[PDB]
Amino acid sequence: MEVLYSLSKTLKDARDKIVEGTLYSNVSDLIQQFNQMIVTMNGNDFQTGGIGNLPIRNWTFDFGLLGTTLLNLDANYVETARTTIEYFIDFIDNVCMDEMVRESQRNGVAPQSEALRKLAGIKFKRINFNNSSEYIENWNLQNRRQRTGFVFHKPNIFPYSASFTLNRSQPMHDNLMGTMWLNAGSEIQVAGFDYSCALNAPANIQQFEHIVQLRRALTTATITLLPDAERFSFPRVINSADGATTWFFNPIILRPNNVEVEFLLNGQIINTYQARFGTIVARNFDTIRLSFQLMRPPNMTPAVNALFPQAQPFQHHATVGLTLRIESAVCESVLADANETLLANVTAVRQEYAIPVGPVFPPGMNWTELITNYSPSREDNLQRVFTVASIRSMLIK
Amino acid sequence: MEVLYSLSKTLKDARDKIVEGTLYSNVSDLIQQFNQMIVTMNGNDFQTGGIGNLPIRNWTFDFGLLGTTLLNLDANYVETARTTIEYFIDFIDNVCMDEMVRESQRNGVAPQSEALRKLAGIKFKRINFNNSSEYIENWNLQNRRQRTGFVFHKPNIFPYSASFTLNRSQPMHDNLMGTMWLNAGSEIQVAGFDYSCALNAPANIQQFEHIVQLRRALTTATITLLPDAERFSFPRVINSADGATTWFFNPIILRPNNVEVEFLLNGQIINTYQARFGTIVARNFDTIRLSFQLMRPPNMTPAVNALFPQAQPFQHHATVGLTLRIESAVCESVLADANETLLANVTAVRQEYAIPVGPVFPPGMNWTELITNYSPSREDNLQRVFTVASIRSMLIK
Amino acid sequence: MEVLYSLSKTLKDARDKIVEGTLYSNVSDLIQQFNQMIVTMNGNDFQTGGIGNLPIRNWTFDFGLLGTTLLNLDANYVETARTTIEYFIDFIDNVCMDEMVRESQRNGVAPQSEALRKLAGIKFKRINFNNSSEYIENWNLQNRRQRTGFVFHKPNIFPYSASFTLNRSQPMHDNLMGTMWLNAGSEIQVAGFDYSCALNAPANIQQFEHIVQLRRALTTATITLLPDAERFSFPRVINSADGATTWFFNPIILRPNNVEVEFLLNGQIINTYQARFGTIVARNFDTIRLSFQLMRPPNMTPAVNALFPQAQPFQHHATVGLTLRIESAVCESVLADANETLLANVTAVRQEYAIPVGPVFPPGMNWTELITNYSPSREDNLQRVFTVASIRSMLIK
Amino acid sequence: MEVLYSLSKTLKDARDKIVEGTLYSNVSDLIQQFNQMIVTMNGNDFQTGGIGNLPIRNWTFDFGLLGTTLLNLDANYVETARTTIEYFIDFIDNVCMDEMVRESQRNGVAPQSEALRKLAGIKFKRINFNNSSEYIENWNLQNRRQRTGFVFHKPNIFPYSASFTLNRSQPMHDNLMGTMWLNAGSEIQVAGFDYSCALNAPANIQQFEHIVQLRRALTTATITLLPDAERFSFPRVINSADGATTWFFNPIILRPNNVEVEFLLNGQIINTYQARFGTIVARNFDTIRLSFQLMRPPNMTPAVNALFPQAQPFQHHATVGLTLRIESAVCESVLADANETLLANVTAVRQEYAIPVGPVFPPGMNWTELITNYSPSREDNLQRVFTVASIRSMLIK
């Protein structure tokens, strides 16, 4: 795969630097590299595809070395180079598409795609060029065990889940208390609600807690924490736990008092912020613990006093919420983002040719079901297909 | 254009690489490029500006070549290079602004700005250095017909439009049914509202449909789909269709059931997802069809039953929402984003010097109109101006 | 594929110019070219077909050269030449069919069909003869992007669409105003109708509009505008808007007065013709904006009086009409036309072998849904298959 | 003019035949032609435009020649050639546009447009390449006075005229007889009508005749003659000849018995066809005499008997029609067609630049008024501008 990245990089560099009229001093090293690639690939035949509707294609390389007796590139040089480069780009695109669809429960990081295996052979090592991109750098770092790292902007670390726990409930659903929440991508929104506005509670203070167990530890994450979860502050009717009935939820948004957000790694408090909204940092963490409180306001003008009776009906239901966006972070393992397009590329390549459901990845590369269960084999295969997708997206957009 | 980018690239690399103490091994190739630029631009007169408040400037080049005998760069070398580089950088800035401020109804891709037009001649073809940047690489890949592609983070593809349709209504506005929708930037929010909560709909399900046709096909776009449109989940008073009378809206947010989202290209369905929220993908799509349903809850707790009567009043109005954010995408033609600054640079350069409204671009370059009407002429000019803006932003920030 | 066109051109020239008794001077250069072609193609093996019912064929060339020491061609020379030419024409026909059947959503300009993709290599650049045909010259221009144009006799730009709009209506469809139109091929036929014959209208004038939005802008179009649209000028019964009932339409044609035709390009009034009929010209346009008026006759004979009463019955319904035939036009992109058989040739080659439906083209190459949705990928695939079809028709008819 | 056509022809052949990899034998003669053009255009200054909004542009030529000894062309060769060819194409386009907007009552054929008038000198005679196209060949043959001919597909010889004659009438317009005719483009739809159905005519026959006198005689024309003109065969309300009052017209269609079409050339009956429909041929003609007869049916079943009474009211009016399409023709002087964009090009070039209305052509170059009065000066200027536009179309579309 280092070889595949090097072919992609040198093809990009050749399509970039080899232009009409450019100095030969500007591309002498590139021409040396490109000739090394040409001599290494000549006299070799590859076969790509053969899964799903992805068609079989046969490649045979017999090309001519680019010239070196030229002081300043002219049109002949560029035209010959581009006839070669188009073919090489098409070959690389097909190889990347072929490897992105293969899949192995055992030995995931190893290369599938017998064409790409032949590339992984020993006589193609000399095509190696440089490994500067993030994904290939992390690939090499992991192949020689070492601290990897990817920077993600708004990562999809949370599996999608909207739900609610009712700590107090009745069949009538007239007097409830609990927490609703939505985790999605980089967004957390939690809303602890109490229909009685914390009357019977000790000291008129109702505690709410939410635990979010990340599937992979993040690092040096910047987080934006705000009060008043928006999505749980309008009147809804929610199907009950088993769907037997539907209960009405009519929020009135109090202020979450003495909130406390803790970022935990193996249970150790790595960071903690007590009533400090706005941008904050989580040094290193695989769990989040948001603990807030619904305190009944002691003083109350007649309007809010009318809102909160002490009898049974409770026409308006108190709610306090928190919103938490992971604006950016650093993860040791690969994830989808709002910035990268790797998940889209892989899923689209699978969907173009209707690749059958394989052993490890879920149907359709559903990211939610992929990240809920993120076992090591699945992570290995995901890293492999993601780095191949990165190599492809280097040349193909 | 290619030569202008080349000048910008070599000046950037001169400003960066040529610093005191640097080995000549690190700048040999760049010094050769710089000397070639000096020789091939010596004794040529350029004249930039002459539109609006952009001042007319005359540029004459007579600069000495740079040394080669050195082992390590020293303070003399850096000083000569710095003097030359500042002049070239000002010249490049003015050429880029002169090219950005101009338009052309016909033959948009061809260069305006007689300075750049002179640059486009055979005389300066020896300056092409390497077309590495994404914008120039796509410029070449389109200048000879190949599959270009730009990657975007939150591309504002949707022209701003907040509006509604009423499939059932009457002047008293007591019993409405219809949809509201806001498309803005890269987010769609659509809410179907029935005042009668699908009381008399067949099977107590009210069907809602929302079709949005993107002005350009988006390739391998990763999307975030979530329920419960926020912006239409709170009470409002909205104008009538005619603007005569204002009508009250007071939603209660049911869930959207058996929601289907269909990504369509040329009418044909490319992708379709059945009640699958969270992160999803779209291979290609000229358009999006969000279909959903308001199902009256069959088993209703007394609270929600009180909310939904069989009578006429209908004090609370049932609704179901959807929100869809294009987190990233790949399009064949340029657009503004939440990451790039090209539209900002272009509009700012126009507004600084008060360029009169030209043939093709709207007044003030408002993206809403500039994407509502996105004719091929406008697209060609926009690509030209954006590539020039990127060339400028390589150096001037 | 310019090499493919060159092969076709030289084989046609060989079949035409190499005839017995012709002076060697008439065919010396052609013999030189044909020998170049033979030497280039010798020892190269091609594979064609394998999609649908198109059979797999293998081509191997080892053909002797034609002499040059003959002062004046005789029968045997022509016999050997034609023995070679028949084989070459067979190979070219098969390659062209193979390239026409295939199809590509992404990167449609490039060749499919391994035979043609091998012809695109560098060994075969010496076959390039010339590019005289309109389609190949446009191909070369657009590839090395330039302003281009295809001249079409009576284009079928408009997709088939027969319909009507009812501005005034009843459930009984007794008293209707509105428009009827058929856009088909090169011909617009639009007729406004008023059942009351401008009884209550302002100043006994009823205004009728009709916008038609060409998918691609046409240039230097010659148009024939006549009054009295025929097809909507006799009794009919037309289904309702939703198909519930059917309404009777008994037209008596008035005369369309102060007719206007505005030819628009991007909302810009390029041309305007008022009270003009017969041959007109639209130098460049993108939509046709027809407008006409139904004036109640101020003076009336007793017969016309009896036709049009002031009361409710309205036995006879006044109509005004307009026919607009685009005789010839010039377009940037390809379009089926009534002069050349490109679409028919491509469609026939698909049907003769039952090619399964591909990604981009409609099923059966249905021109109506091909032109209604005419995205860039569809357009460039159409250009490729049209060019190959012309190349084939240079030899096979 | 011949020189301008030779410039266009050699540029077109340069753009076609001078392509990558072609043998030198394929383009030797063209290369020497190109060198001749360059040498004889060097050192000469031309000025173009100055009328209307044509910019006053200045052309100066100093270009290098093209190599001779290389045995097979290549990319850089084509690059130099293309750098020259683009400028020459621009110059020719501007010269043609400048010539197409000039007129002269006296000596129209002579060249206006001082650029072309300079090209008409003895210096530029060495450019003359070969006058192959139809328009240039007839230009030469008609200057050196000889017989010429333009082949036309549906020539719009007939000026647009829809009208009628009443051989019987009343102030009521209730019992009429006469003819109506549309002469438009290549179409003659003529319909005789009789409100009495030839009741009191001799032998129950009513004679109708229509004389259509061409402006210029046509040669070897194929004419499609069909019965039952579809255009006048439905209800109408028609203003009177004076415009005072309108009259109803309610056709019932008989076939025209013993129709007789005579094609006349200066009185003599060149051709005559009795009772022959479908395609026919007129070898040489200048006037068309269409005679037909409305014979009342002798035997007449009860429904049609009810239609035709012996009394006065005459609710239905008998008519016999004829349709005549000049499908093809050959004309001595120039005309517009449905197969050539020459009138369209000239009118477009005038309308783009808003040329003030000149002596000879009508305002707007409307073909109806340009053919109604077609005096020899107008014909000469029209032929000049048409051949100039033909020259332009060889390069610009």
CSV table of C-alpha atoms in Angstrom, one decimal, chain A residues 110-343:
chain,number,residue,atom,x,y,z
A,110,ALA,CA,-3.3,-7.0,5.1
A,111,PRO,CA,-4.0,-6.2,1.4
A,112,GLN,CA,-6.9,-7.9,-0.5
A,113,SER,CA,-7.2,-7.3,-4.2
A,114,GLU,CA,-4.6,-9.7,-5.8
A,115,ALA,CA,-3.5,-6.8,-8.1
A,116,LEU,CA,-2.7,-4.8,-5.0
A,117,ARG,CA,-1.1,-7.8,-3.4
A,118,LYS,CA,1.2,-8.1,-6.5
A,119,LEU,CA,1.9,-4.4,-5.9
A,120,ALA,CA,2.7,-5.2,-2.3
A,121,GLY,CA,5.3,-7.7,-3.6
A,122,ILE,CA,9.1,-7.0,-3.2
A,123,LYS,CA,10.1,-5.8,-6.6
A,124,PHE,CA,7.8,-2.8,-6.4
A,125,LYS,CA,9.4,-1.3,-3.3
A,126,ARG,CA,11.6,0.9,-5.4
A,127,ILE,CA,8.5,2.8,-6.5
A,128,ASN,CA,8.2,4.2,-3.0
A,129,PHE,CA,8.3,8.0,-3.2
A,130,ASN,CA,7.3,9.7,0.1
A,131,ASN,CA,4.6,9.3,2.7
A,132,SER,CA,3.4,12.8,3.6
A,133,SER,CA,-0.4,12.6,3.7
A,134,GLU,CA,-2.0,12.2,7.1
A,135,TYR,CA,-3.6,8.8,6.4
A,136,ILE,CA,-0.5,7.2,5.0
A,137,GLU,CA,1.7,8.7,7.7
A,138,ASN,CA,-0.5,7.2,10.3
A,139,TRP,CA,-0.5,3.9,8.3
A,140,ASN,CA,3.3,3.7,8.5
A,141,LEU,CA,3.3,4.8,12.1
A,142,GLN,CA,0.9,1.9,13.0
A,143,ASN,CA,2.7,-0.6,10.8
A,144,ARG,CA,5.8,0.2,13.0
A,145,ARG,CA,3.9,0.4,16.3
A,146,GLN,CA,3.9,4.1,17.4
A,147,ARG,CA,1.5,6.8,18.5
A,148,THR,CA,-0.8,7.4,15.5
A,149,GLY,CA,-3.1,10.4,15.3
A,150,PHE,CA,-5.8,12.0,13.1
A,151,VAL,CA,-7.2,15.5,13.5
A,152,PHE,CA,-10.9,15.6,13.0
A,153,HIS,CA,-13.2,18.6,12.6
A,154,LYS,CA,-16.6,17.8,14.1
A,155,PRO,CA,-16.0,14.0,14.2
A,156,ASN,CA,-18.8,11.5,14.1
A,157,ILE,CA,-17.8,9.9,17.4
A,158,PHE,CA,-21.3,9.4,18.7
A,159,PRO,CA,-23.6,6.8,17.2
A,160,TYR,CA,-27.0,8.4,16.5
A,161,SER,CA,-29.4,7.8,19.3
A,162,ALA,CA,-32.5,9.8,20.4
A,163,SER,CA,-34.1,8.4,23.5
A,164,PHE,CA,-35.3,9.1,27.0
A,165,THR,CA,-35.2,7.5,30.5
A,166,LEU,CA,-38.1,8.0,32.9
A,167,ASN,CA,-36.9,7.7,36.5
A,168,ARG,CA,-40.5,8.3,37.7
A,169,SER,CA,-43.5,7.4,35.6
A,170,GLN,CA,-47.1,6.3,35.8
A,171,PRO,CA,-49.5,4.6,33.2
A,172,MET,CA,-51.3,8.0,33.0
A,173,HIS,CA,-47.9,9.7,32.2
A,174,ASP,CA,-49.2,12.8,34.1
A,175,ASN,CA,-46.3,13.1,36.5
A,176,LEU,CA,-43.0,12.2,34.9
A,177,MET,CA,-39.3,12.9,35.6
A,178,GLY,CA,-36.2,11.8,33.7
A,179,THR,CA,-33.9,12.8,30.9
A,180,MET,CA,-34.3,12.9,27.1
A,181,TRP,CA,-31.3,13.0,24.9
A,182,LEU,CA,-30.0,13.0,21.4
A,183,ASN,CA,-26.4,12.0,20.5
A,184,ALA,CA,-25.6,12.5,16.8
A,185,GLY,CA,-22.2,13.0,15.2
A,186,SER,CA,-20.5,15.7,17.2
A,187,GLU,CA,-23.7,17.0,18.9
A,188,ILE,CA,-25.0,16.0,22.4
A,189,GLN,CA,-28.2,17.5,23.6
A,190,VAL,CA,-29.5,16.3,27.0
A,191,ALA,CA,-32.6,17.6,28.7
A,192,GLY,CA,-33.6,16.6,32.2
A,193,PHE,CA,-37.3,17.2,32.8
A,194,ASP,CA,-39.5,17.1,35.9
A,195,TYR,CA,-43.2,17.5,35.7
A,196,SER,CA,-43.5,18.5,39.4
A,197,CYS,CA,-40.8,21.1,39.2
A,198,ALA,CA,-38.9,19.4,42.0
A,199,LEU,CA,-41.3,19.7,44.8
A,200,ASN,CA,-41.0,16.4,46.7
A,201,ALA,CA,-37.3,16.3,45.9
A,202,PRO,CA,-34.8,16.9,48.7
A,203,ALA,CA,-34.1,20.6,49.1
A,204,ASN,CA,-36.2,21.2,46.0
A,205,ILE,CA,-33.2,20.1,43.8
A,206,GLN,CA,-33.6,17.3,41.3
A,207,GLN,CA,-30.3,15.8,40.1
A,208,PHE,CA,-29.9,14.7,36.5
A,209,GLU,CA,-27.0,12.8,35.0
A,210,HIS,CA,-26.0,11.6,31.6
A,211,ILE,CA,-23.1,9.3,30.7
A,212,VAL,CA,-21.8,9.1,27.2
A,213,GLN,CA,-19.3,6.3,26.6
A,214,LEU,CA,-17.2,7.1,23.6
A,215,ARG,CA,-16.2,4.1,21.5
A,216,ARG,CA,-12.7,5.5,21.1
A,217,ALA,CA,-10.7,7.9,23.3
A,218,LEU,CA,-10.4,11.4,21.9
A,219,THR,CA,-7.5,13.7,22.6
A,220,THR,CA,-7.0,17.5,22.9
A,221,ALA,CA,-10.6,18.1,21.9
A,222,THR,CA,-12.1,21.6,21.7
A,223,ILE,CA,-15.7,21.5,22.9
A,224,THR,CA,-18.5,24.1,22.9
A,225,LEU,CA,-20.9,23.7,25.9
A,226,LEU,CA,-24.1,25.8,26.1
A,227,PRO,CA,-27.3,25.6,28.2
A,228,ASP,CA,-30.8,25.1,27.0
A,229,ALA,CA,-30.9,22.1,24.6
A,230,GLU,CA,-32.9,23.4,21.7
A,231,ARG,CA,-34.3,20.1,20.5
A,232,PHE,CA,-36.0,19.3,23.8
A,233,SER,CA,-37.7,22.7,24.4
A,234,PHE,CA,-40.9,22.6,22.3
A,235,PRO,CA,-44.1,20.7,23.0
A,236,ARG,CA,-43.9,17.1,21.7
A,237,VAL,CA,-46.0,13.9,22.0
A,238,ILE,CA,-43.7,11.0,22.5
A,239,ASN,CA,-44.5,7.3,22.1
A,240,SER,CA,-43.9,5.5,25.4
A,241,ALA,CA,-41.2,3.1,26.2
A,242,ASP,CA,-42.9,0.1,24.5
A,243,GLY,CA,-45.0,2.2,22.1
A,244,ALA,CA,-48.3,1.2,23.9
A,245,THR,CA,-49.3,4.9,24.3
A,246,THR,CA,-48.1,8.4,23.6
A,247,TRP,CA,-47.5,10.9,26.4
A,248,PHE,CA,-47.4,14.7,26.1
A,249,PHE,CA,-44.3,16.7,27.0
A,250,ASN,CA,-44.6,20.4,27.4
A,251,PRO,CA,-41.3,22.0,28.4
A,252,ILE,CA,-40.7,25.2,30.3
A,253,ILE,CA,-37.0,25.9,30.1
A,254,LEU,CA,-35.4,26.7,33.5
A,255,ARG,CA,-31.7,27.3,33.9
A,256,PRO,CA,-29.5,24.2,34.6
A,257,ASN,CA,-27.9,25.2,37.9
A,258,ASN,CA,-24.6,24.0,39.2
A,259,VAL,CA,-23.9,22.0,36.1
A,260,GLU,CA,-20.7,20.0,36.1
A,261,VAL,CA,-19.1,18.3,33.1
A,262,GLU,CA,-16.5,15.6,33.6
A,263,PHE,CA,-14.2,14.1,31.0
A,264,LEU,CA,-13.1,10.6,32.1
A,265,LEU,CA,-10.5,8.1,30.9
A,266,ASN,CA,-10.8,4.6,32.4
A,267,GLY,CA,-12.8,6.3,35.2
A,268,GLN,CA,-10.1,8.8,36.1
A,269,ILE,CA,-11.3,12.4,36.1
A,270,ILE,CA,-9.1,13.9,33.4
A,271,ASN,CA,-11.0,17.2,33.2
A,272,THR,CA,-13.9,18.8,35.1
A,273,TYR,CA,-15.7,22.1,34.5
A,274,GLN,CA,-18.2,23.4,37.1
A,275,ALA,CA,-20.6,25.9,35.5
A,276,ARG,CA,-18.2,27.1,32.8
A,277,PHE,CA,-19.9,27.3,29.4
A,278,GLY,CA,-18.4,28.4,26.2
A,279,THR,CA,-15.4,26.8,24.6
A,280,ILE,CA,-13.5,24.4,26.8
A,281,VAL,CA,-10.9,21.6,26.3
A,282,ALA,CA,-10.9,17.9,27.0
A,283,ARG,CA,-7.3,16.8,27.3
A,284,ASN,CA,-7.9,13.1,26.9
A,285,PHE,CA,-11.1,11.2,27.5
A,286,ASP,CA,-13.3,8.3,26.4
A,287,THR,CA,-16.3,9.1,28.6
A,288,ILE,CA,-18.4,12.2,29.3
A,289,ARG,CA,-20.4,12.7,32.5
A,290,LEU,CA,-22.9,15.6,32.5
A,291,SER,CA,-24.5,16.3,35.9
A,292,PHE,CA,-26.9,19.1,36.2
A,293,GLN,CA,-29.7,20.1,38.6
A,294,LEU,CA,-33.3,21.4,38.3
A,295,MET,CA,-33.7,23.7,41.3
A,296,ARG,CA,-37.1,25.0,41.9
A,297,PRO,CA,-36.7,28.7,42.0
A,298,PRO,CA,-37.5,29.9,45.6
A,299,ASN,CA,-38.7,33.3,44.7
A,300,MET,CA,-41.3,33.4,41.9
A,301,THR,CA,-43.4,36.1,40.4
A,302,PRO,CA,-47.1,35.3,40.0
A,303,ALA,CA,-46.7,34.2,36.4
A,304,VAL,CA,-44.2,31.4,37.2
A,305,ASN,CA,-46.0,30.6,40.4
A,306,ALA,CA,-49.1,30.0,38.2
A,307,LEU,CA,-47.0,27.8,35.9
A,308,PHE,CA,-45.9,25.6,38.8
A,309,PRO,CA,-48.8,24.4,41.0
A,310,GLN,CA,-48.4,22.1,44.0
A,311,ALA,CA,-51.5,19.9,43.2
A,312,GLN,CA,-51.5,17.1,40.7
A,313,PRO,CA,-52.3,18.5,37.2
A,314,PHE,CA,-48.9,20.0,36.2
A,315,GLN,CA,-49.9,21.6,32.9
A,316,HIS,CA,-46.3,22.8,32.2
A,317,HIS,CA,-43.3,20.6,32.7
A,318,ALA,CA,-40.0,22.0,33.9
A,319,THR,CA,-36.9,21.2,31.8
A,320,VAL,CA,-33.2,22.0,32.0
A,321,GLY,CA,-30.8,21.1,29.2
A,322,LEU,CA,-27.2,21.1,28.0
A,323,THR,CA,-25.8,21.2,24.5
A,324,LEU,CA,-22.2,20.0,23.8
A,325,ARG,CA,-20.5,20.1,20.4
A,326,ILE,CA,-17.1,18.6,19.8
A,327,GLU,CA,-15.8,21.3,17.5
A,328,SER,CA,-12.5,19.5,16.8
A,329,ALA,CA,-10.5,16.6,18.3
A,330,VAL,CA,-7.6,14.3,17.8
A,331,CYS,CA,-8.2,10.5,17.7
A,332,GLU,CA,-5.9,7.6,17.5
A,333,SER,CA,-8.4,5.7,15.3
A,334,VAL,CA,-10.1,6.8,12.1
A,335,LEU,CA,-13.5,8.3,12.0
A,336,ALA,CA,-15.9,10.1,9.7
A,337,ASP,CA,-16.0,13.9,9.8
A,338,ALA,CA,-17.7,17.0,8.4
A,339,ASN,CA,-14.4,17.8,6.6
A,340,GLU,CA,-13.2,14.5,5.1
A,341,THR,CA,-15.1,12.7,2.4
A,342,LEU,CA,-13.6,9.3,2.9
A,343,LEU,CA,-16.7,7.6,4.3
